[PDB]
Structure 1
Amino acid sequence: NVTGLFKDCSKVITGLHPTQAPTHLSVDTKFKTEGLCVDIPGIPKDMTYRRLISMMGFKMNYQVNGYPNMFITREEAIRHVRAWIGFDVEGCHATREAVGTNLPLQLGFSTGVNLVAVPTGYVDTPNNTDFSRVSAKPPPGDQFKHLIPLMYKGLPWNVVRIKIVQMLSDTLKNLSDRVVFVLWAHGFELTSMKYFVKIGPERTCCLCDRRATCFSTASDTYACWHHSIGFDYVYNPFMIDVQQWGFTGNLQSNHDLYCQVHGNAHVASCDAIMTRCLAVHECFV
C-alpha cells in the first residue's frame, strides 16, 4: 500500500540515490536488495534535479495534547455558525517538467472574493524543497474555459495569503474568535490550505487577551482578527466537509433543493457561497 501524499510528479526515469531519497520507496531500484538499500561506490548523486512533490492527500486526523483538531463535528460547527466562511479552490494541472498534481489557481470565499494565484509548487532539489512557480495548464474542459485568462492574472503566494488573512480579519473581527471553512469534497481545499495555514497549540494575541487566529513569519508573532495587520498566515483554523453529511449528488443539485437565489456563475466564490448556503439550510431547518 502506497499513498498519493508527496507523490513524485517529475518525468525523471530514475529513482533517487539512497542519501537523497526521502523514503525507501523513492530510492532507485538499482540500490534495492533484501528489503534494504546498498551504497554503490561509483554511482554518484544527482546534483541538478528539480522534482515536483504532490501536496494532494493530507489527513488531518492527529490526536495531540494541546493541539486543537482542524476538522470539527457538525454540532460544534452549528455553535460557531458566525465563523462560517465557505471556501472552494479551482485548480490547474502541473505540466512540462512535471505531471500528476493540481496547483491552486482561483481561491473563492462565501464573501464573494476570488483571489488568483501564480501556479506555485513544492519542488525537491538536492539541498532542500523550493516553493516556486511551476509550469501549469488549465483543466481541458469547456466548463473551465474561464480559467485560461487567469493563468496570467495571478499574484505571488506571499501577496495572496496576506489578502486572505486581511479578508478574514475584516469579515470576522466583530463576529467570532475563529474561522470555520465550510467545504464540499475538501481534498483540494486542504491542499490549498498548505499555502496559507499554520497550526500549533492554542495561543493568545500579542496585543490583547483574545485567542490567536493569525501568524506572522516576519516577526514570529500571533494575532487575533483585530490586530492582524501585515500578518501572512491563518493560524489554527477550523473546517467541515458538507459533502460527508450523506448527500447523494453534486454540490449544485443539493444546494438547489433548498435555494433558488445563488445561481452557478462557475467561479470558485459561487461554489463557496453555495457550500455555506447548503450548510445553513441543512443544519438549521
Structure 2
Amino acid sequence: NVTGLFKDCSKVITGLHPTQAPTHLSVDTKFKTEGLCVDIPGIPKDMTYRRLISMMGFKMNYQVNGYPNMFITREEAIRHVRAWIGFDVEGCHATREAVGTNLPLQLGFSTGVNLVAVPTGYVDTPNNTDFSRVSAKPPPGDQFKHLIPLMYKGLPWNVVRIKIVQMLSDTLKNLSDRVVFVLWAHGFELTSMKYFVKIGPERTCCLCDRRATCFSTASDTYACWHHSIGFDYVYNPFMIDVQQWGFTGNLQSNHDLYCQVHGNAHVASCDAIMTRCLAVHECFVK
C-alpha cells in the first residue's frame, strides 16, 4: 500500500542509490534483497539528478498539544463567518523533465483577486530540495484555453505569497482575528497552501497583543493582520471543505440552486466567490 504524497515525477528509469533515496520504496531494485537493501561497492551515487517530488496528497489530521487544527467544524466555521475567504486554484501539469503532478497557476479568492504564479515545484537533488521553476503546460486545451497566456504572466512565489498576505491583511484586519479558507474539493488548494502557509503553536503579534496570523521568514517574526507589512507567510490558517456538506453535483450546479447573481466566468476567483456564496446560503438559511 502506497500514497501519492511525495511521488517522484521524474522520467528517470532508475531508482535511487541507498544513501540518496528518501525511502526504502524509492531505492533502486538492484540494491533490494530480503526486504532490506545492500550496498554495492562499484555502483556509485548519482551526483546530478533533479527529481520533481509531488505535493499532492497532504493529510492535515495531526493531533498535537498546542497545535491548532487547520480543518475546523461547520459550527466553528459558522461562528467565524467574518473570517471566511473563498479559495480556489487553477493548476498546470508538470511537463518535459517531469510528469505526474500539478503546480499552482492562478490563485483565486472571494475578494475577486487572481494571482498568477510561475510554475514552481519541489525538486530533489543529491544535496537538498530545490524550490524552483519547472516546465509546465496548461491542462488539455478546451475549458483551459484562458490559462495558455498565463503561463508567461506569472510572478515568482516570493512575490505571490507577499501579495496573498497583503490582500488577506487588508480584508480581515477590521473583521476577524483569523482566516477561514472556504474550499470545494480541497485537495489542490491544500497543495497550493504549502507554497504560502506555515503552521505551529499559537503566537501573539510582535507589535501588539492580537493573535498572530502572519509569519516572516526574513526576520523569524509574527504579526497580526494589522502589522503584517512585508510578511511573506500565512500563519496558522483555518479551513473547511464545503463539498463534504452532503452535496450531490458540481460547484456551479449547487451554487445556482440558491444564487443567480454570480455567473460562471470560468476563472479561479469566480469559483472562490461561488464557494463562499454557497457556504453562506447553506449555513444561514433555514
TM-score range, shorter chain: over 0.9
SS at match of 2:252: helix
Q: Give 1:183 deviation, angstroms.
A: 0.2
Q: Give 1:177 deviation, angstroms.
A: 0.1
Which consecutive residues of structure 2, in runs of 5 or more, have no partner in the other structure?
Answer: none
Counterpart Cα distance in 2 of 1:190 and 1:8:
19
Q: Give 1:240 deviation, angstroms.
A: 0.1
Aligned pairs for 1:56-205 within 5 A: 56-205=56-205
Counterpart Cα distance in 2 of 1:142 and 1:26:
36
1:222-281 alpha-carbon deviations (Å, 9 max, x no partner): 000000000000000000000011100100000000000001000000000000000000
1:177-200 alpha-carbon deviations (Å, 9 max, x no partner): 000000000000000000000000
Q: Give 1:58 deviation, angstroms.
A: 0.1
Match for residue 54 of structure 1? Answer: 54
Q: Give 1:155 deviation, angstroms.
A: 0.1
Aligned structure 1 segments of 4 or more residues deviating by more than 6 angstroms: none
SS at match of 1:143: coil
SS at match of 1:123: strand
Q: Give 1:141 deviation, angstroms.
A: 3.3
Counterpart Cα distance in 1 of 2:91 and 2:221:
31
1:56-111 alpha-carbon deviations (Å, 9 max, x no partner): 00000000000000000000000000000000000000000000000000000000
Counterpart Cα distance in 2 of 1:151 and 1:75:
39
Match for residue 35 of structure 2? Answer: 35
Counterpart Cα distance in 1 of 2:281 and 2:245:
13
Aligned pairs for 1:196-215 within 5 A: 196-215=196-215
SS at match of 1:208: coil
1:124-174 alpha-carbon deviations (Å, 9 max, x no partner): 000000000000000013111000000000000000000000000000000
SS at match of 2:275: helix
Q: Give 1:119 deviation, angstroms.
A: 0.3
Counterpart Cα distance in 1 of 2:248 and 2:181:
21
Q: Give 1:117 deviation, angstroms.
A: 0.1
How many equivalent residue pairs? 285
What RMSD, in angstroms, separates the aligned Cα atoms of the two structures? 0.3
SS at match of 2:243: helix
Counterpart Cα distance in 1 of 2:249 and 2:23:
38
Counterpart Cα distance in 2 of 1:237 and 1:19:
37
SS at match of 1:215: strand
SS at match of 1:275: helix
Which consecutive residues of structure 1, in runs of 5 or more, have no partner in the other structure?
Answer: none
Counterpart Cα distance in 1 of 2:150 and 2:25:
37
Counterpart Cα distance in 2 of 1:244 and 1:48:
44
